[PDB]
User: Which sequence fits this backbone?
RNA sequence: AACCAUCUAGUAGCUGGUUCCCUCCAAAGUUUCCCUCAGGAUAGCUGGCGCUCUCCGCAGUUUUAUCCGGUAAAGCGAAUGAUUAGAGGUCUUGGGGCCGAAACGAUCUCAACCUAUUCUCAAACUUUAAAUGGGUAAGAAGCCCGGCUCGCUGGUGUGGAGCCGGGCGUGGAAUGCGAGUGCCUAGUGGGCCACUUUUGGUAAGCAGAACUGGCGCUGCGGGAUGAACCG
RNA sequence: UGGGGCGGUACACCUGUCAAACGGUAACGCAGGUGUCCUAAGGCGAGCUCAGGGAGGACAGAAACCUCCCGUGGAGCAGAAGGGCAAAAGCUCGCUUGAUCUUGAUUUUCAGUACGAAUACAGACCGUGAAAGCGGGGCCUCACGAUCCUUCUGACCUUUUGGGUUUUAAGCAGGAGGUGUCAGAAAAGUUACCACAGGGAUAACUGGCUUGUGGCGGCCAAGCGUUCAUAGCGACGUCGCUUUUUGAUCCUUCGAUGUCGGCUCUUCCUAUCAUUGUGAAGCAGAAUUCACCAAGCGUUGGAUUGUUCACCCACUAAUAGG
RNA sequence: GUCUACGGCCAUACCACCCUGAACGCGCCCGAUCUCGUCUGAUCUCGGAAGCUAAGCAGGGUCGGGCCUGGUUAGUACUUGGAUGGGAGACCGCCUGGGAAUACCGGGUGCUGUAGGCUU
C-alpha cells in the first residue's frame, strides 16, 4: 500500500479564506525580559514619586 | 488615470478593454442607465432631489454638474464615482472579433484608444 | 555493441561531467582533434569553412570521429597532403548513463557510465577547415558528405574571418603592414598602444 | 582520560572556593528492606511467575562517570556528586603529558 | 529528507564579500541604538557568537531591550498561516539602522515648517503627495533639418 | 480433537444494510507523535449560537522611498578544477643518436619547465549578475514646550528612563470595503488531471516534487463520441 | 517495502547538492559522516608567523643542519565536508581550573507541547591580566534519553499516628544505573493436514500504453568481389517500422473469466517456399541468384521427447512464416 | 604651503623602478652604570646627541601593472503574464512589460576630524 508522502497543494487557499491576520498590535507591551537592574530602579522611582509631589 | 492605476490595468490587460471615451458616450451612459448607490441601495437617478440630499455639500445639484466633474476630472471625483453603481451594460450588438487576443494581433483586449466609442454604440 | 542514438539525443538532464564523483569512466574515442598541416603560417591559408549546427541536441564522440576521418580522406585524394588544416571544435564532456537489468527489479536504479557526448547550442561551430580560397568547392563537397554522419540539419557556411582569427580579411593587410597585428605562428598578436613605449621602439628597430 | 586528584572549587556551606579530594562513585548494595523490594517480593510470591519486566536490549556501551568531592577542611567533610561526559578509557593522575619529546 | 541544522543553506549568505574579510570596522560597535528604533538585520560569519537564525535574515524590527553588548528585537515571522511576533537576542555586529523612516520624518518636519510659513499669507500649499500625473501638452520645434529616415536592415548570416 | 445445553446478544482497526418534505450555509485527503501505514489523537479546514462597537480601522493590490537575495546567463587573456593547438627561451634537467671516449664543446634532435597567445567546459567552481519576488515605513499610539522622582550609570542640578502639566487638526500617497471577538462543534486525514520549471529512468495513460487552476462536490453550449479540453 | 521473501535502513542524528536568487519542500535519488577524543587538544596574557620556492656553505647526497630574500594564507586549527582566522582562532612560554553555585527570560525542532543544544542578561565566590576587560567547556554547524524502581549527596528540615525517647522506613531537592524499532511491549520456528475476516489499496494468465532486448527495413560508401565502390555485398556511423519474444508498469476483475501441450475445425494476414506473367545478373544452354504485380489454389508420411521448440530418415513442385 | 601625536572611511591610499626634499620635528646614530631581557645589549629596556639625509618617510615621475569610474558590447542573450500561433518532434516566432556580463576604447590615482608645531 504505497502512498504519496508530502504536498503543499491547496494550503494557500485554505489560509487565505479566513485570512492571514496581523498580530494584534498594542501600545504598552509587557516588560517581561527586561534587565532587572534597570527594572528595579524604575520600580523604585515609581515608588518615590509621591515624595516630590507638592512642587508639581 | 495615473501611474498607480495604469500599472494595475497592465497587470490585467487580457481581461479588459479600455480607452479614452468621448462626451456623447458619457451622456448616453449616465442618462440612460444612471443608478445611484443611496443608503446601500441601487436607486434610479430620476430627480435632482436624490442628488441634492447626498452631494449638496460639493455644490453638486444635477446631472450636468456631475458630467462636468467627470469630463473635467475635478476635485471631487472619488465621491462622484463611488456614488455611481457599476454600469450594467449589455451584450454587444453586431458581435466581437475575437475575445481571446489583443487588439494589435486582431482582438479586442487592451488599449484601443478611441474605438471604444464604436464598441459602446454596439453594446448599448 | 553499444546502443542506438535515439536514446541519447535530446538535452534532457543536467550536465554530468567527469570529476571526483564520477570515476571509473571508460575513455573517449576521439583523441586527435585536429589534423592536416597544423604547422602552418596564417598567411598561406586564408579561407575558412564552418559546419554550423541548427538544433539544441547532443552529438556523440563516435560521429565526431567518423566525420573527421571521412573529411580527411576526401581532402587527401583531392588537394594533396599539404593544403589544409582541419580543426574540430567540440570537446565532449557530458557523461551518459545506462540502466541495466542484470530478482530485485527497478528499485535503486541509478546507472553506470556508458560514455561521453557533447551538448550543442544553436549557432555553435562544429568543424572548421582552413586552406586557400581556390579550393572552395572541394571543401564544400567534403563537408556535404560529412553531413550524413550527424543528425538533424546543419548549414555549410564559409567564414569571413582570415583563418582562425577574429579579424576581417579586407583591412587585415593594412593592419599588418602598419604592425598592429603580428604573426606568431598559427596565432596573431594584437598590439595596442597601452604598453610601454620602449617596446614600440624595439618593434620598429 | 586522566584527571588530577585535587580540585579547588565551591562549597555551598562555606561559601568560598576550597580544596576538594576527588574520588569516583560506586553503586551501593541493594537494600532488602526497602519499600519497592517488599512490594516486588510479595507480588512475585505465590503462583503467577514473572510479574514485572526484564530488560534485554542492552545497546549502548558507556557510562557517565561521577565524582565524589570531599571538602578538605575538618569542619565540613561534606561531599558532593559531579557528573561528566562519556568516556571509554579512564585513569587518575597518570603522567601529565609532556611537550616536545621524542618517540621510541 | 533534509536535516534541520541551524546553518543549512548558508554557504553563501554569511560568507563575507570579496576583499572585505578580516577585521570589523569599529563604527559597528561604537554606534548607539535607542528603544523603538527601526532596525534591519544582516548576518555576519566572523562572529559566531550570537548569530541570529537564518530565517530572521533580512527582517527588520523594533528594539524592546538592551544589554551591555546586545539588543532584543521584535519580528513578524509567518508560520503556516498565522504570524508570530517573536523576539531575538542579537549581538550588535549583525545590525544596521534602516533609513526608511528618516525621509518620512523629514517630511513631517517640512510640513510644520511650510505650515508656519504660508500661514499668515493665506496661500494654500499642497501638503499631500500627489501621484505622477499625465504629462502636459507641449511644442516640438523642428528647427530646420528633417527627420532622419530609419530603414530595417536586410538580413545577413554571420555564422 | 466427537456430540447436547449453558457462560453468550461473547470481541472485530474488516464487508454489508440504515425508513418523510422544503429552505439556508458548506468541506478534506496536509503538519507532528504512536509496534502508526486498511487506524487514532493533535493542529489545520467547517457550522451553529451569540456578544462589543459602527451608519476610525482592514486589504492575497499598486505607487514612492529603503534593505535583502546569489538561479538563468556570462566568464576562464581573473581564482579552483579539467583541456587542444602551435610560437619564443636558456638550462631549470633528461632520453635516442651521430663526428665526438664522454663532456651544459658542439651536433641533429625530441623532452619536460618559464613567458605572450589560441580552441572548448562545470548540479556539488565564480569576480560579475538580472527579470519575477520577500521584508519595513507612509502621523494623534504623532510632533513641540515647562517641570518633578531614581537606591542605576557618571569628572559635571551629566546621560538614560520614567513621571506630571499645557500647545498644534489641510488627518498628511492612489483604490476599495462595515469591522472586532468569545464559546461549543460533527465529517475528512486512500486522492487525481492540465500549462510551466524539474529529478530517476531509453520511454511509459510510470514512479517522486514546486507554483496556479480545475475534477472529485457541477449540470450547460461546442470538440461526432468522452470525468478533467475551449467558452 | 515499485507483489511479498532474501537484501538495504533511507526507523534518531549532521554537512554539501538536488531547491526553481527570502524562508519551507519529496523519491530504497546522489556524494558522505556519527554513537567518540581531550589535564588540556579547556582558561587568561605576552611573544613569535605558516605552506612552497630561490642562492650559498666540510662530511651533506633529490632528501639531515645554519643563513638571506620573496611568501593574502596556496599550511594548520583531533575528527565528515563546508564557512571563518595573520602583530590571530595558527605556533612557542608563564600562571591557573567559570568544565563551579543559583533563580527565572528567550531562540532552534515545533502542536509553536517536550528532550536535547545554544544565546542574551542578573545575583554570589573565583581565575587571569599593569589595566579597559575576558571566562560560566572544546572557533561555528552533530556527538544523545520519560514515568516507575534502586542508589548517593544535602538541612540541628517534616511525619512515623493516645503521649514521650531512641534505631529503621517513608517524605523533600539535585545527580547517576536505560530503554539505538532511539516520545521508551519483556519474546524463536513450521504447516503440502489446515482454518476465519477481507483485499484487485497487492502479485502469478489474458487485456491496455511504451519497445530497451529480439525481429524486419532504409541513407552515406571506406573495402571484398582480378579488374571496376554499388552484379552480388558493405565496416566505422546514422534514420525508421512492427508487437508472434522477452522484460518494465498495475488501470480493470480475488462473493472465482477453468490455468501447459496434443487432437479436431473455420477463416484470416503477407514480409512469395513453389506454380502463372515479367524485369536484372560476374545469365551461352542447363542449373542458380536479386527484384516487381500477386496470398485465389497448395505446403506431407514417420523414429525419440509430456513437450511447444530441437535433431534426423523418406517422397516431393514445395516440404515458407504468423 | 607642510608636519607631528591620536584617528574615521579602508587600494583614486597597493606593487615595482627612477628623481628631488628650506626650517623644526621623524629617523638613522654612540654607549651598558643602575631597572629589564638575551646564545649574542642585534631585537626588546635604559643613559647620551658628535655626525648624516645615504636609506626610511614625503612629493613628483613612468604611452608602467593593478584598483576605481564611463562609453562600446546591446535593446542582443535571458525573462513575468497571453493566444484554436507555427512545427512530425526538437524547438521557434509574435504581443504585452523588465533588462544584464567580458574583449575593445576613454578618464582618474586618496578624501578628511581634534589638539599642537615650522616658515619664529
Ligand atoms: N513445500 C514445497 N515443496 N513447495 C513447493 C511449496 C508449496 C507451497 N506451500 C505452495 C506454493 O505454490 N508456493 C509458491 C507459490 C508462488 C510463489 N511465487 C510465485 C511466483 C512468484 N513470481 N513469486 C512467488 O513468490 O512461490 C512460492 C514458493 O515457491 O515458495
Ligand atoms: Mg443580427
Ligand atoms: Mg533526468
Ligand atoms: Mg506459585
Ligand atoms: Mg448484535
Ligand atoms: Mg454473535
Ligand atoms: Mg469484497
Ligand atoms: Mg544555490
Ligand atoms: Mg548557463
Ligand atoms: Mg470525531
Ligand atoms: Mg505522475
Ligand atoms: Mg498511481
Ligand atoms: Mg469548488
Ligand atoms: Mg467546472
Ligand atoms: Mg473528434
Ligand atoms: Mg483553456
Ligand atoms: Mg475558460
Ligand atoms: Mg510490511
Ligand atoms: Mg532557498
Ligand atoms: Mg526558491
Ligand atoms: Mg557573575
Ligand atoms: Mg577552536
Ligand atoms: Mg508510568
Ligand atoms: Mg515505542
Ligand atoms: Mg534493436
Ligand atoms: Mg576495390
Ligand atoms: Mg490498480
Ligand atoms: Mg466475477
Ligand atoms: Mg465460468
Ligand atoms: Mg507485397
Ligand atoms: Mg650595540
Ligand atoms: Mg631620509
Ligand atoms: Mg594602467
Ligand atoms: Zn566548605
Assistant:
Amino acid at each position: 500500500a504505497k502512498s504519496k508522502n508530502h504536498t503543499t497543494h491547496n494550503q494557500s487557499r485554505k489560509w487565505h479564506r479566513n485570512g492571514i491576520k496581523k498580530p494584534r498590535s498594542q501600545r504598552y507591551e509587557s516588560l517581561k525580559g527586561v534587565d532587572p537592574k534597570f527594572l528595579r530602579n524604575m520600580r523604585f522611582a515609581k515608588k518615590h514619586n509621591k515624595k516630590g509631589l507638592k512642587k508639581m | 488615470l495615473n501611474k498607480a492605476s495604469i500599472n494595475m490595468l497592465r497587470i490585467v490587460e487580457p481581461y479588459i478593454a479600455w480607452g479614452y471615451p468621448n462626451l456623447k458616450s458619457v451622456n448616453e451612459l449616465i442618462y440612460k442607465r444612471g443608478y445611484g448607490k443611496i443608503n446601500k441601495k441601487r436607486i434610479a437617478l430620476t430627480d435632482n432631489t436624490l442628488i441634492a440630499r447626498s452631494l449638496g455639500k460639493y455644490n453638486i445639484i444635477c446631472m450636468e454638474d456631475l458630467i462636468h466633474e467627470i469630463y473635467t476630472v475635478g476635485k471631487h471625483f472619488k465621491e462622484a464615482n463611488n456614488f455611481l453603481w457599476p454600469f450594467k451594460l449589455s451584450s454587444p450588438r453586431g458581435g466581437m472579433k475575437k475575445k481571446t487576443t489583443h487588439f494589435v494581433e486582431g482582438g479586442d483586449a487592451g488599449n484601443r484608444e478611441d474605438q471604444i466609442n464604436r464598441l459602446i454604440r454596439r453594446m448599448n | 555493441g553499444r546502443r542506438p542514438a535515439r536514446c541519447y539525443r535530446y538535452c534532457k538532464n543536467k550536465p554530468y561531467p567527469k570529476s571526483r564523483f564520477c570515476r571509473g569512466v571508460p575513455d573517449a574515442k576521439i583523441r586527435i582533434f585536429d589534423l592536416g598541416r597544423k604547422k602552418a603560417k596564417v598567411d598561406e591559408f586564408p579561407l575558412c569553412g564552418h559546419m554550423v549546427s541548427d538544433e539544441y541536441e547532443q552529438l556523440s564522440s563516435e560521429a565526431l570521429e567518423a566525420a573527421r576521418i571521412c573529411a580527411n580522406k576526401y581532402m587527401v585524394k583531392s588537394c594533396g597532403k599539404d593544403g589544409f588544416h582541419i580543426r574540430v571544435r567540440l570537446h565532449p564532456f557530458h557523461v551518459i548513463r545506462i540502466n541495466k537489468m542484470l530478482q530485485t527489479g527497478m528499485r535503486g536504479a541509478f546507472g553506470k557510465p556508458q560514455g561521453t557526448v557533447a551538448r550543442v547550442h544553436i549557432g555553435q561551430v562544429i568543424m572548421s577547415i582552413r586552406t586557400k580560397l581556390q579550393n572552395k568547392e572541394h571543401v564544400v563537397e567534403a563537408l556535404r558528405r560529412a553531413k550524413f554522419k550527424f543528425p538533424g540539419r546543419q548549414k555549410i557556411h564559409i567564414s569571413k574571418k582570415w583563418g582562425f582569427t577574429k579579424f576581417n580579411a579586407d583591412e587585415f593587410e593594412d593592419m599588418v603592414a602598419e604592425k598592429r597585428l603580428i604573426p606568431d605562428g598559427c596565432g596573431v598578436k594584437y598590439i595596442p598602444n597601452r604598453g610601454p613605449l620602449d617596446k614600440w621602439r624595439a618593434l620598429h628597430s | 582520560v586522566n584527571v588530577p586528584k585535587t580540585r579547588r572549587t565551591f562549597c555551598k556551606k562555606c561559601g568560598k572556593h576550597q580544596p576538594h579530594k576527588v574520588t569516583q562513585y560506586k553503586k551501593g548494595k541493594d537494600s532488602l528492606y526497602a519499600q519497592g523490594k517488599r512490594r516486588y517480593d510479595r507480588k512475585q510470591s505465590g503462583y503467577g511467575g514473572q510479574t514485572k519486566p526484564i530488560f534485554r536490549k542492552k545497546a549502548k556501551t558507556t557510562k557517565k562517570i561521577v565524582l565524589r568531592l570531599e571538602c578538605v577542611e575538618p569542619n565540613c567533610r561534606s561531599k558532593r556528586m559531579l557528573a561528566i561526559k562519556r568516556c571509554k578509557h579512564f585513569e587518575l593522575g597518570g603522567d601529565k603529558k609532556r611537550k616536545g619529546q621524542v618517540i621510541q | 529528507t533534509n536535516t534541520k541544522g541551524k546553518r543549512r543553506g548558508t554557504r553563501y549568505m554569511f560568507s563575507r564579500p570579496f576583499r572585505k574579510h578580516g577585521v570589523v570596522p569599529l563604527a559597528t560597535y561604537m554606534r548607539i541604538y535607542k528603544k523603538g528604533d527601526i532596525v534591519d538585520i544582516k548576518g555576519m560569519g566572523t562572529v559566531q557568537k550570537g548569530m541570529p537564525h537564518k530565517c530572521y535574515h533580512g527582517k527588520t524590527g523594533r528594539v524592546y531591550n538592551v544589554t551591555q553588548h546586545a539588543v532584543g528585537i521584535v519580528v513578524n515571522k509567518q508560520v503556516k498561516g498565522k504570524i508570530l511576533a517573536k523576539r531575538i537576542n542579537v549581538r550588535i555586529e549583525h545590525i544596521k539602522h534602516s533609513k526608511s523612516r528618516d525621509s518620512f520624518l523629514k517630511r513631517v518636519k517640512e510640513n510644520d515648517q511650510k505650515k508656519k510659513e504660508a500661514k499668515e499669507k493665506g496661500t494654500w500649499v499642497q501638503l499631500k503627495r500627489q501621484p505622477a500625473p499625465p504629462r502636459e501638452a507641449h511644442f516640438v520645434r523642428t528647427n530646420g533639418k528633417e527627420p532622419e529616415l530609419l530603414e530595417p536592415i536586410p538580413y545577413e548570416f554571420m555564422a
Notes: Helices of chain D lie at 35-44. The radius of gyration of chain D is 22 Å. Chain D has one helix and six strands. The CA atoms of residues 4 and 93 of chain D lie 5 Å apart.
